[PDB]
Design a protein around this ligand. Structure first.
Ligand SMILES: [Zn+2]
Ligand SMILES: [Zn+2]
Ligand SMILES: [Zn+2]
Ligand SMILES: [Zn+2]
Ligand SMILES: [Zn+2]
Ligand SMILES: [Zn+2]
Ligand SMILES: [Zn+2]
Ligand SMILES: [Zn+2]
Ligand SMILES: [Zn+2]
Ligand SMILES: [Zn+2]
Lengths: 75, 75
């Protein structure tokens, strides 16, 4: 299935994914297109922060769902 | 000759048909009544998905037989 990600530029990318992909899997896909490392990625869906160990199905993220990418800086 | 078409939502459609009607004809009839494109229709009878080119009689679909309409997710 396809989901969309609102990137740090404000544009929208399309990701090919499976219901059981982890948030970590999605972050790896995002780095390939945008050049942001997973550690600096925070993903938002329906106003909620997504945890690396959980899957798209866990959050009931269906096809054409839109995730928001937000920069995570520490220190 | 009359048949019933049940949708996922438990809705019951009644169609006027003939034994020689093709599944394509049935889909055209459903598009007339419900406005759904044949492309997006899957028709099932006795657990079997019906093929566009075959007829109701090919499938032993009779007066007052019930078909199930499954929709192909858009996209
Ligand atoms: Zn797909
Ligand atoms: Zn697809
Ligand atoms: Zn797989
Ligand atoms: Zn991580
Ligand atoms: Zn869309
Ligand atoms: Zn009749
Ligand atoms: Zn006739
Ligand atoms: Zn057709
Ligand atoms: Zn009767
Ligand atoms: Zn659509």
């Amino acid at each position: 299935m396809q989901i969309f990600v609102k990137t740090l530029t404000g544009k929208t990318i399309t990701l090919e994914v499976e219901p059981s992909d982890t948030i970590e899997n999605v972050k790896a896909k995002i780095q390939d297109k945008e050049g942001i490392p997973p550690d600096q990625q925070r993903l938002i869906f329906a106003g909620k922060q997504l945890e690396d160990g959980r899957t798209l199905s866990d959050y009931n993220i269906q096809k054409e769902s839109t995730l928001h990418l937000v920069l995570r800086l520490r220190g």
